[PDB]
A = this chain, B = another copy of it.
Amino acid sequence: XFTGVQGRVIGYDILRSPEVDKAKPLFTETQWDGSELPIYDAKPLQDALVEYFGTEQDRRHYPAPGSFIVCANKGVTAERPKNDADMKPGQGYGVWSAIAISFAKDPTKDSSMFVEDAGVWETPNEDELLEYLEGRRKAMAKSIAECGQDAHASFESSWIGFAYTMMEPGQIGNAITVAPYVSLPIDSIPGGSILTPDKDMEIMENLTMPEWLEKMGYKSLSANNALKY
């Protein structure tokens, strides 16, 4: 999971990318109170995080070495043996992870939720995997819509994102789903000061991602779909 009354999400609440505005829903599952909950591909939000932390070779506001970051995380590791066939019980040919953040209708009363899952894939059929994942996307979309009734939480959109790797023989695949809860450095807020904390958040809440990249002199790593997951 949850981000609630104390939180913001990179790419939606702060540093919002115009793609969040460009984004067409994939479909809308009917959530319990009658509202249609649009479902969207979270690849905007995902691209936004990459922008803010940077990458291992162009590191930006990554979490401090040795820090303690509480994360909502799940992750799976699986091996593919050298060409073996009826392989050991914790092996497979592919691996996958998924995340969905769902924004609450009233964030003063209810929280926004994260669903995270991950698993291994048994067949070598990449085309089978991909379809199972769209099937699983559609599945998560429903559990959300349902389970919100139990605490009577009403949401307004859900953004689901997936990532996967097929192993070649004799290679291990690792797949992780993580949502970190962090605090932001001053040299990240143009015009920000350690002395103006609350305004600092407001600056980030108002800058768009392209604006922030220009202001900081950073090259948009999203570019036009430069990032694959």
Contacts and interface: CB of A to CB of B under 8 A. Distances in A.
A213 to B, nearest CB: 24
Contacts of A4: 64-67
Interface string A138-155: 000000000000111000
Interface string A186-229: 00000000011111001000000000000000000000000000
A85 interface: no
Interface residues of A, number: 28
Nearest to A202: B199
B109 A65 contact: yes
A112 B65 CA distance: 8
Contacts of A111: 65-66
Interface of A: 2-7, 56, 64-68, 70, 107, 109-112, 150-152, 181, 195-199, 202
Given A2-B66, A199-B202, 15 more contacts: A2-B65, A4-B65, A5-B65, A5-B66, A6-B64, A56-B150, A56-B151, A56-B152, A65-B107, A65-B109, A65-B110, A68-B181, A195-B198, A196-B198, A198-B198
